[PDB]
Amino acid sequence: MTEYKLVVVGAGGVGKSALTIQLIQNHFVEKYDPTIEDSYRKQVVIDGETCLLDILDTAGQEEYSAMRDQYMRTGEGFLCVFAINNTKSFEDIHQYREQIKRVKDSDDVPMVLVGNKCDLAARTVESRQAQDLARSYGIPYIETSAKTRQGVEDAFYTLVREIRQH
Amino acid sequence: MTEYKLVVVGAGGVGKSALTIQLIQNHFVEKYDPTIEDSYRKQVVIDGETCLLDILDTAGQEEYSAMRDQYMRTGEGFLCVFAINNTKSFEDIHQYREQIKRVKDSDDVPMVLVGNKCDLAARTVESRQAQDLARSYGIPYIETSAKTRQGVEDAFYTLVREIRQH
Amino acid sequence: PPTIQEIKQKIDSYNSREKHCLGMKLSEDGTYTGFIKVHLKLRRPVTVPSFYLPLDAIKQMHISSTTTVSEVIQGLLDKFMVVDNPQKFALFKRIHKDGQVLFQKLSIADYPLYLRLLAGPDTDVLSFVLKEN
Amino acid sequence: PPTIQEIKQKIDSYNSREKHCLGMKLSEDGTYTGFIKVHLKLRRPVTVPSFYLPLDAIKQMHISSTTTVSEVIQGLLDKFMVVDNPQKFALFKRIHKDGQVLFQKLSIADYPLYLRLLAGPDTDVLSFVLKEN
Ligand SMILES: Nc1nc2c(ncn2[C@@H]2O[C@H](COP(=O)(O)OP(=O)(O)NP(=O)(O)O)[C@@H](O)[C@H]2O)c(=O)[nH]1
Ligand SMILES: Nc1nc2c(ncn2[C@@H]2O[C@H](COP(=O)(O)OP(=O)(O)NP(=O)(O)O)[C@@H](O)[C@H]2O)c(=O)[nH]1
Ligand SMILES: [Mg+2]
Ligand SMILES: [Mg+2]
């Protein structure tokens, strides 16, 4: 099978680990355990192709910012995650887009914009503003809930599709 | 760690599997079970470097000759094995050297000449003739016994050395 | 479940997607012979001069349509000189279920070559793995 | 076994071969804090709508010199929501012995950070792996 190197990035607490663990283990992590950097290997079937996903779940906390160049070099596609009830996380997205573009020296690195925690009622980031940002970058926008599992497969599978069409 | 793709080739019954299994499992296979094609993954330390050896143990029987192009394309170094009590196996060595050279399109593919079954008293291939052949090719000659374990590590480790100096 | 002529056509299709010396062959009354690969992923207890050493191997075997999982397991344990209780081991098919690749334990009475033929040559679709409980 | 100033120099050497936010830090009387990675290689029994699904993960953890193997095991089982008996699991160091890379079971009373410091930053020299018996 072909292998895909996926990296999950975004501000601390947006649900990067929760999304990853929903894909890997098929359950929701309620606990908030800040990540330093974790990696996963998951075999999947996407549109009839068997794929090995190597998934890097990264730190949103600033103390680990120095690790970014390293993982941005090696990653093939990026899930750029914010939480729809956290305006600051949405503001932080462009910073990730820009650092990836710098490190990889490309303006079309495979990326998906993910608005997570869509199970929550108290939304502060309007879907239209997120759709606008994704359109600006030329990338897909998907809302997910690591809790309900809504959009989780679509987010990762869309990213793999973005990579294999690149 | 760095990975090395090793391929073990030579006429049927010379001890290709026995040598491989001595390296992998640290024991001697007395049974004669002709190979179709088997593969092994073994982590080792060679001169202080940790290496992953992917080892392909190939068929000496003619019925599987069609599989050679495929494994010769993918292999990085070749242990070319004959048995010191089998003159025909020694005559067959040049055929392997030539097919590898053809398939890889190179006259310096990493190779080691291995004279196996050196535990046996009834020798029919003189060591000098084998030394002469290896000198002709510009490769090392090592005598091994899969039975006693004599030379087994040196053969594989020499091959890895040949690859990393290439 | 299935027709013999169905098996005949299945073998011909299989073989078009495979090398000649690795193809399946039809025999008497819808029986056939052919090849599988089994991935052994075992931890072997070892003594120094506690600790284990990995056995990580893919063994290619020539078997028939009547060869059972039980036969495949015993043959591998004997070939790799594994002395543990054979009933501590199981053969699994790695297959697609629900977008997920899962490992399903095989019945000791199952026939791996039949599974292989039905799946086609691609190990991405079905692979066999031998594991200790 | 060892000197505190020995530990101080060992930490400084360690950190020169590692990124800044991933370095070790000296604390009171020769204690220290630092990072390890544990490779979880587990088979998880699953139900469809028998079968297992792999959990293949490398978890990076911030721990101290007094953190025990027992603590590392329990913390991982809880983090990955593994409900099996914790005594069915063991932590191994993958290390060099006799030109061979072997896995050695750790005592539940051992201190992984100490092992990590002594080995240096290179996971090729020492890696940790969590396995079910
Ligand atoms: N309601 C809801 N909560 C979620 C969702 N995703 C994550 N959370 C919750 O948000 C908290 C933080 O999630 P976590 O996955 O740890 O975030 P992170 O982005 O990995 N954090 P860090 O960057 O520090 O590693 C947890 O308490 C988690 O249960 C979601 O889709 N819905
Ligand atoms: N005395 C002795 N016998 C050996 C040695 N190596 C292999 N043999 C014996 O020679 C026979 C054939 O060995 P085997 O490893 O199966 O050879 P092969 O080259 O792999 N055969 P094939 O090409 O058909 O797969 C066995 O009966 C084996 O025990 C050796 O170093 N010394
Ligand atoms: Mg996280
Ligand atoms: Mg053989």
For β-strands C89-97 and C100-105, DSSP reports them as antiparallel
- Which residue's CA is minimally distant from atom 26 of ligand 2? B32
Task: Tell me if B46 and D99 make a contact (CB, 8 A cut-off).
Answer: yes
Cis ω on the peptide bond leading into residue D2 (within 30° of 0)? yes
CA distance B72 to B70: 6
Phi, psi angle pair for D32, to nearest 5°? -160, 165
Kindly report each contact of residues A50-54 with a partner whose C-beta sits within 8 Å and lies 24 or more positions away, as own/partner.
A50/A1, A50/C96, A50/C101, A50/C124, A50/C125, A51/A1, A51/A2, A51/A3, A51/A4, A51/A160, A52/A1, A52/A2, A52/A3, A52/A4, A53/A3, A53/A4, A53/A6, A53/A156, A53/A160, A54/A3, A54/A4, A54/A5, A54/A6
User: CA neighbours within 13 Å on the CB side: how many for D34?
Assistant: 28
CA distance C65 to C78: 21
Task: Confirm if B147 and B135 have CB atoms less than 8 A apart.
Answer: no
Q: Please classify residue B80 by burial: count the beta carbons closer than 10 Å to its beta carbon, then call 0-12 exposed, 13-18 middle and 19+ buried.
A: buried
> What are the structure tokens assigned to D85, written together?
């008996």
The DSSP call for residue A78 is E
CA distance C65 to C115: 9
Task: Confirm if B89 and B82 have CB atoms less than 8 A apart.
Answer: yes
Chain D residues with beta carbon closer than 8 angstroms to that of B1: 124
- Which CATH number goes with the domain that contains C49? 3.10.20.90
Indicate the top mutation candidate among B114, B147, B149 to test ligand 2's pocket, ranked by most ligand atoms within 8 A of CB.
B147
3-state DSSP call for residue B86?
Answer: coil
Ligand 1 binding pocket (C-beta < 6 A) is A 12-18, 29-30, 32, 34-35, 59-61, 116-117, 119-120, 145-147
The DSSP call for residue A139 is -
CA of A8 to the centre of ligand 3 (A): 9
- Cβ contacts of D91 within 8 Å, gap of 6 or more: D38, D69, D72, D73, D105, D106, D112, D128, D129, D130
The DSSP call for residue B36 is S
Q: Please classify residue C77 by burial: count the beta carbons closer than 10 Å to its beta carbon, then call 0-12 exposed, 13-18 middle and 19+ buried.
A: buried
Helix segments in chain B, DSSP class H = 16-25, 68-74, 87-91, 93-104, 127-137, 152-164
* A43 and chain C in contact, CB less than 8 A: yes
Name the helix (H) or strand (E) containing A20.
Answer: helix A16-25
Give the residue among B48, B2, B4 at the shortest CA–CA distance from B160: B4
Task: Confirm if C4 and C117 have CB atoms less than 8 A apart.
Answer: no
Cβ count within 10 A of residue C60: 17
* A25 and chain D in contact, CB less than 8 A: yes
> What are the structure tokens assigned to C80, written together?
């790799």
Instruction: Compute CA distances D102 → B34, B80, B149, D37, D96, whole Å.
Output: 29, 28, 19, 18, 6
CA distance C13 to C7: 10
Residue tagged 């390890």 (tokens): D36
Helix segments in A29-126, DSSP class H = 68-74, 87-91, 93-104
The DSSP call for residue D128 is E
Residue tagged 């290496």 (tokens): B51
The DSSP call for residue D125 is T
For β-strands C51-64 and C32-46, DSSP reports them as antiparallel
- Cβ contacts of C96 within 8 Å, gap of 6 or more: A45, A50, C102, C125
* CB nearest to D100's CB, from C53, C102, C131: C53
Q: State the virtual CA torsion across C111, C115, C117, C119 in degrees, nearest 10.
A: -170
Residues, chain C, total? 133
> What are the structure tokens assigned to C19, written together?
């090398």
Closest chain D C-alpha to A132 CA, distance in angstroms: 35
Instruction: Compute CA distances C62 → A110, C33, C69, whole Å.
Output: 44, 7, 13
Task: Confirm if C76 and C130 have CB atoms less than 8 A apart.
Answer: yes
Judged by its nearest atom, the ligand closest to the C-alpha of residue B30 is 2
Q: Please classify residue D40 by burial: count the beta carbons closer than 10 Å to its beta carbon, then call 0-12 exposed, 13-18 middle and 19+ buried.
A: buried
Q: How many structural domains is chain C composed of?
A: 1
The DSSP call for residue A32 is -
**Maximum alpha-carbon separation in chain D:** 60
CA distance C68 to D110: 45
Task: Confirm if A15 and A21 have CB atoms less than 8 A apart.
Answer: no
CA distance D97 to D100: 5
Residues with CB under 5 A from ligand 4 (ion): B 16-17, 35
3-state DSSP call for residue D101?
Answer: strand
3-state DSSP call for residue A96?
Answer: helix
Name the helix (H) or strand (E) containing B143.
Answer: strand B141-143
Domains of chain A: 1-166 (3.40.50.300)
Instruction: Compute CA distances B153 → B22, B138, B145, C44, whole Å.
Output: 9, 21, 11, 20
Q: What share of chain A is helix, strand, coil (3-state, %, to 5)?
A: 40, 25, 35
CA distance A32 to A15: 9
CA of B34 to the centre of ligand 4 (A): 5
Phi, psi angle pair for B119, to nearest 5°? -70, -20
- Cβ contacts of C121 within 8 Å, gap of 6 or more: C14, C17, C18
Cis ω on the peptide bond leading into residue C2 (within 30° of 0)? yes
CA distance D38 to D40: 6
> What are the structure tokens assigned to A79, written together?
């899930």
Residues, chain B, total? 166
Residue tagged 């779940």 (tokens): A57
Q: Please classify residue A24 by burial: count the beta carbons closer than 10 Å to its beta carbon, then call 0-12 exposed, 13-18 middle and 19+ buried.
A: buried
CA distance D98 to C74: 31
Q: Please classify residue A58 by burial: count the beta carbons closer than 10 Å to its beta carbon, then call 0-12 exposed, 13-18 middle and 19+ buried.
A: buried
User: CA neighbours within 13 Å on the CB side: how many for B127?
Assistant: 10
- Cβ contacts of B44 within 8 Å, gap of 6 or more: B50, B51, B53, B156, B157, D99, D100, D101
3-state DSSP call for residue B74?
Answer: helix
DSSP chain C: ---HHHHHHHHHHHHHTS-GGGS-EE-GGG-EEEEEEEEEEEEEEE----EEEEEEEEEEEEEETT--HHHHHHHHHHHTT--S-GGGEEEEEEEEETTEEEEEEPPTT--HHHHHHHH-S-TTT-EEEEEE-
